[PDB]
Design a protein around this ligand. Structure first.
Ligand code: OGA
Ligand code: MG
Ligand code: NI
Ligand code: ZN
Length: 331
C-alpha cells in the first residue's frame, strides 16, 4: 500500500505531465497521495496562470465577512458578520493597515504559534466565495475555469444526465482569516491555486481517520452536535493542532505559497489560515473514485449549511433515501 503513514506528498510535474489533468490526479493517487487528504503540486517553471496581477484592484468584494470568534484559543467557533462592499484595492489597503497587518515574525512556525495564541482576540475580514476566475483564457494547463464538470463526470460514470454547473470561486484573505474544519460538499475533491500574496497554512486529517475528528468535534462542541448530526457542514468550528495532538487525532500540516496548487481529496477534513493579504482561486471536481464517497457523504438537514443549486442533483441521484429530508433543510 503506497503512503501508509498518510503523509502530505509534494509533486513537481514536468510541462509534458501538466497537459492531462485527469491523468496526473490518477498518477498522484497511484503513489498514495490521497491517503493524506491533501497534496501540493508545484507547476513546471514554464507555466503561468496569467501575465500579471497589476490590474485586479477593481474586482468587487460585494459582501466582505468579519470573522468573529467565541470560545477558547484552541477550541472556538466563528460567525461571519456581513460588512459593506469594497474593491480588492480597498481590501488590500485594509489588510495592510496597522489594525490588520501581519505582525513581525521569524519564520512560518513562529507565525503559526502567534495565530493559535491570538486569533480569537481579533476579527479579520475575508472576501469569500466570489464567483470568478483569474486564469487567462489562453492558459491551457490546470486552468480552474476549464476543468471537466462534475455533472459530466456523473453522466459519464452513471449514465444519468443532470442539471447544474460547476464554476470557480475567488478568495481574498488577510492575516488571521480562517477556514474552519470541513470536507467538501458531497465529499468532492477541491483544487486551490494561490494566485498572489502571502501564504496559507493548511491542516488535514487522512480520509481513513475522518470519523476520529468527527467524534472529537461532537465532544468539543456538544450543543452544536445536538443541533445537527453533521454540524461540521456549517463550517464554523476550529480545533488547534495542540488540541488535536492531546486527543490523539491523526493529522498533518503544510504551508502553501503563491504559485502553488493544493488538492484536497474526498472526505479529507481540512482547516487553515492566511498569513497576510492574498488571493486564491478554488473549485470542486470529481473523478471516478469520488462516486462511492458521494454516495456515503453526510448531510446537514437542520437548515444551517445551505448550499449551491448544483448539490440538489447530486443528492437526488446518489442519495435518494436522504433526498426528501435534505431538501426540507434547503427550504
Ligand atoms: O482558501 C480557503 O479559504 C478555503 N479553501 C478551501 O477549503 C479549499 O480549497 O478547499
Ligand atoms: Mg480590476
Ligand atoms: Ni475546502
Ligand atoms: Zn446542520
Amino acid at each position: 500500500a503506497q503512503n501508509p503513514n498518510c503523509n502530505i506528498m509534494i509533486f513537481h510535474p514536468t510541462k509534458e505531465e501538466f497537459n492531462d489533468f485527469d491523468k496526473y490526479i490518477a498518477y498522484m493517487e497511484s503513489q498514495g497521495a490521497h491517503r493524506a487528504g491533501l497534496a501540493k503540486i508545484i507547476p513546471p517553471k514554464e507555466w503561468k496562470a496569467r501575465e500579471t496581477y497589476d490590474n485586479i484592484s477593481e474586482i468587487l468584494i460585494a459582501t466582505p465577512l468579519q470573522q468573529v470568534a467565541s470560545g477558547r484559543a484552541g477550541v472556538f467557533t466563528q460567525y461571519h458578520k456581513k460588512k459593506k462592499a469594497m474593491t480588492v484595492g480597498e481590501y488590500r489597503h485594509l489588510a495592510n493597515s496597522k489594525k490588520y497587518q501581519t505582525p513581525p515574525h521569524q519564520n512560518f512556525e513562529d507565525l503559526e504559534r502567534k495565530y493559535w495564541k491570538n486569533r480569537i482576540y481579533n476579527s479579520p475580514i475575508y472576501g469569500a466565495d466570489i464567483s470568478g476566475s483569474l486564469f487567462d483564457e489562453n492558459t491551457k494547463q490546470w486552468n480552474l475555469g476549464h476543468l471537466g464538470t462534475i455533472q459530466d463526470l456523473l453522466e459519464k460514470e452513471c449514465g444519468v444526465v443532470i442539471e447544474g454547473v460547476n464554476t470557480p470561486y475567488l478568495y481574498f484573505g488577510m492575516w488571521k482569516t480562517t477556514f474552519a474544519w470541513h470536507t467538501e460538499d458531497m465529499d468532492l475533491y477541491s483544487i486551490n491555486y494561490l494566485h498572489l500574496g502571502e501564504p496559507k497554512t493548511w491542516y488535514v486529517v487522512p480520509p481513513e481517520h475522518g470519523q476520529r475528528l468527527e467524534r472529537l468535534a461532537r465532544e468539543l462542541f456538544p450543543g452544536s452536535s445536538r443541533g445537527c448530526g453533521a454540524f461540521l457542514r456549517h463550517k464554523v468550528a476550529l480545533i488547534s493542532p495542540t488540541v488535536l495532538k492531546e486527543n490523539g487525532i491523526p493529522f498533518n500540516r503544510i504551508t502553501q505559497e503563491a504559485g502553488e496548487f493544493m488538492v484536497t481529496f474526498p472526505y479529507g477534513y481540512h482547516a487553515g489560515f492566511n498569513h497576510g493579504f492574498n488571493c486564491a482561486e478554488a473549485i470542486n471536481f470529481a473523478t471516478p473514485r469520488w462516486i462511492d464517497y458521494g454516495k456515503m457523504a453526510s448531510q446537514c438537514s437542520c437548515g444551517e449549511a445551505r448550499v449551491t443549486f448544483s448539490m440538489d442533483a447530486f443528492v437526488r441521484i446518489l442519495q435518494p433515501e436522504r433526498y426528501d429530508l435534505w431538501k426540507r433543510g434547503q427550504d
